[PDB]
Amino acid sequence: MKKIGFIGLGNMGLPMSKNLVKSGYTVYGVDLNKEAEASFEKEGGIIGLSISKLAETCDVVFTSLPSPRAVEAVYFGAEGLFENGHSNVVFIDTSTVSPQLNKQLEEAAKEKKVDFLAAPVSGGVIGAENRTLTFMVGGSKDVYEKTESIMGVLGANIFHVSEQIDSGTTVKLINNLLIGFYTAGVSEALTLAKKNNMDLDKMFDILNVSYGQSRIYERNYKSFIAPENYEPGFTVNLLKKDLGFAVDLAKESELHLPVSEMLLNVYDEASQAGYGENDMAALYKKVSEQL
Amino acid sequence: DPMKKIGFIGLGNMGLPMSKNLVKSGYTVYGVDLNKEAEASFEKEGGIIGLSISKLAETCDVVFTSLPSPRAVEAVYFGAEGLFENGHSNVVFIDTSTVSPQLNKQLEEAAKEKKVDFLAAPVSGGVIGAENRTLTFMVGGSKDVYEKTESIMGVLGANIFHVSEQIDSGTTVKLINNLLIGFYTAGVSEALTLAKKNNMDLDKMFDILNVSYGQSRIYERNYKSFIAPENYEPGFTVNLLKKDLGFAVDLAKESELHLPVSEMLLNVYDEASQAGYGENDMAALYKKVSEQLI
Ligand SMILES: NC(=O)c1ccc[n+]([C@@H]2O[C@H](COP(=O)([O-])OP(=O)(O)OC[C@H]3O[C@@H](n4cnc5c(N)ncnc54)[C@H](O)[C@@H]3O)[C@@H](O)[C@H]2O)c1
Numbered sequence A: 001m002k003k004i005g006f007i008g009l010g011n012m013g014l015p016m017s018k019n020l021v022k023s024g025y026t027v028y029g030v031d032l033n034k035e036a037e038a039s040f041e042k043e044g045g046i047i048g049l050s051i052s053k054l055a056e057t058c059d060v061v062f063t064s065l066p067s068p069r070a071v072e073a074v075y076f077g078a079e080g081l082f083e084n085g086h087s088n089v090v091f092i093d094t095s096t097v098s099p100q101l102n103k104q105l106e107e108a109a110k111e112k113k114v115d116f117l118a119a120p121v122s123g124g125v126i127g128a129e130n131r132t133l134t135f136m137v138g139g140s141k142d143v144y145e146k147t148e149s150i151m152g153v154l155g156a157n158i159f160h161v162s163e164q165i166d167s168g169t170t171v172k173l174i175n176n177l178l179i180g181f182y183t184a185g186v187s188e189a190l191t192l193a194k195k196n197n198m199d200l201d202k203m204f205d206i207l208n209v210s211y212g213q214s215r216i217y218e219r220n221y222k223s224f225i226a227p228e229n230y231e232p233g234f235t236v237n238l239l240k241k242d243l244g245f246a247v248d249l250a251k252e253s254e255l256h257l258p259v260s261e262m263l264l265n266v267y268d269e270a271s272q273a274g275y276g277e278n279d280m281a282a283l284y285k286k287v288s289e290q291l
Numbered sequence B: 001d002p003m004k005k006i007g008f009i010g011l012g013n014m015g016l017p018m019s020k021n022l023v024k025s026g027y028t029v030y031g032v033d034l035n036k037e038a039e040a041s042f043e044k045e046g047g048i049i050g051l052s053i054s055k056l057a058e059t060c061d062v063v064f065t066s067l068p069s070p071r072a073v074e075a076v077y078f079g080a081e082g083l084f085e086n087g088h089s090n091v092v093f094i095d096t097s098t099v100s101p102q103l104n105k106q107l108e109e110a111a112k113e114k115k116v117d118f119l120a121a122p123v124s125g126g127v128i129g130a131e132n133r134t135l136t137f138m139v140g141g142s143k144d145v146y147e148k149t150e151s152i153m154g155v156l157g158a159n160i161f162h163v164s165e166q167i168d169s170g171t172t173v174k175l176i177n178n179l180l181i182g183f184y185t186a187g188v189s190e191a192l193t194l195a196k197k198n199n200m201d202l203d204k205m206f207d208i209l210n211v212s213y214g215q216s217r218i219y220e221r222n223y224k225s226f227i228a229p230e231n232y233e234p235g236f237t238v239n240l241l242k243k244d245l246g247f248a249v250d251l252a253k254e255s256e257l258h259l260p261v262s263e264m265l266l267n268v269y270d271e272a273s274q275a276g277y278g279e280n281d282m283a284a285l286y287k288k289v290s291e292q293l294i
């Protein structure tokens, strides 16, 4: 049973790396935050090894990192994964970064002759905890096929999008752009409904079998709005960061997406008003403030 | 309880097929429209014409209205020759028009003064939905009256819903339904243009998003029935979506509410119409945004 490396043991990485240990893998963990390392260790993971030592020793190494800088700091340079990867290693980045960085990563992997997949994930911490993540994978199909079963203990839907390394990332950004639209629509629509004294429960039962339906509507309303609980979940701040990546790509693709750009501002304002660390469904509360 | 004699005022885009479906369903239907061709077409199927609004109110068990505006509704319901002043003591009036919550309330206040029954039951689904009896009825008003008339409305639609005893509740839910459509069509249109611009396989992408939190009935509708096959025949026009968005925005502004994205969407669909997509399906907002592709 394989040796897996896991770099980034935060909100997503901790439950993912824990699940691998529970699944019977020997898991070596690295995180800048020694407390995160402590938590992973208590789950049965092994700490104390360098990023470089993970690259030399592990069959597959996953990364779950919070920014493009962090991904760059881990993959590149004399101490990083690509320079130190043994000849059979597979690296799988689950971080969300720009398509361009996906390409820069792949180009360094091809130069070192190591395997690399850009496999961003969807489903949040709840999905990570429950092994129901969606993996959207760009990169070599042979590498996908040989690591599909490991990713399959972490997620419920494992997809290969195409051989293009940024194909996963792109579908993910699209997914999250749609989420931004759906959350905004629910937030504004329900505010109108409430101001006019609608029973939001009866309304949902009707709209949920109409063209008003969306999984996000069901999520936001049933799991947050109805129970008056805005504990993340998936933050206003994280959604706005993803919308940022999507608008960046739109701008690089010479596209003006007027409602998308407005939404970036909507979530940015929700944050600046103090809902940044609330669940995205709290956009409802932000829009309702005026009542 | 007798529900054989049905009046139907407004034999237009929706009324004509609805009224004929009532005839086909064994009801004795008395129809009224300014449009003599519409009256003749109805009569030709076994509809009865030549009776006044007044006469329908006096003699019919239930009278439906399908009218094009608030003023048309007012002209039919109020005044000496109208429905309320001439309704017999057991009549039920059902308006299937879309008007403001405020008019729904004024209609009901007049119904209560006259001690007649009234439901505000706006329909959605277009001409084809009316023909195929797949309309949605979203109904506000008395539950007892709803329970009494559900069986008739049900021969005309697939989804018949009683929302609440608030007379405007059906209208309000209809408006919210259409507002969510506006958002969802906008997201699909913008998000797929981004995907297309970056050469994504839109079929594969749908397979993935349709079982992820990108999922919506509108995404399935717009993508599989319109965008994928490059068909932009309505369906549900840009122009009619934006009319209903306008009504949602009017209701908001009435309630002192600022809904910035909603107001922005009203303008997006107005610009889409101005660019030439007004009588296309709403899914054509994708083609509007896609004008930016190479
Ligand atoms: N949290 C979610 O709901 C969610 C959902 C889908 C995708 N994601 C994506 O997953 C990625 C990780 O997200 P997260 O929520 O777990 O972030 P997080 O900030 O909770 O965790 C990231 C971890 O990486 C560690 N780290 C940072 N730089 C490092 C370095 N050089 N070496 C080692 N460790 C380093 C941090 O200490 C932190 O513990 C992000 O790209 C995010 O977009 C998150």
Ligand SMILES: NC(=O)c1ccc[n+]([C@@H]2O[C@H](COP(=O)([O-])OP(=O)(O)OC[C@H]3O[C@@H](n4cnc5c(N)ncnc54)[C@H](O)[C@@H]3O)[C@@H](O)[C@H]2O)c1
Residues within 6 Å of the ligand: B009, B010, B011, B012, B013, B014, B015, B032, B033, B034, B035, B038, B066, B067, B068, B069, B072, B075, B076, B096, B097, B098, B099, B123, B124, B125, B126, B127, B240
């Ligand atoms: N067209 C659609 O696709 C559609 C779909 C769903 C809902 N609706 C709604 O249903 C309602 C009716 O729409 P429509 O397209 O059928 O309108 P329309 O203009 O085709 O039909 C209304 C009919 O009422 C008649 N009329 C007007 N005033 C009258 C009067 N005083 N006496 C007798 N007849 C009169 C007109 O001659 C016309 O035939 C509107 O409120 C609209 O918003 C329309």
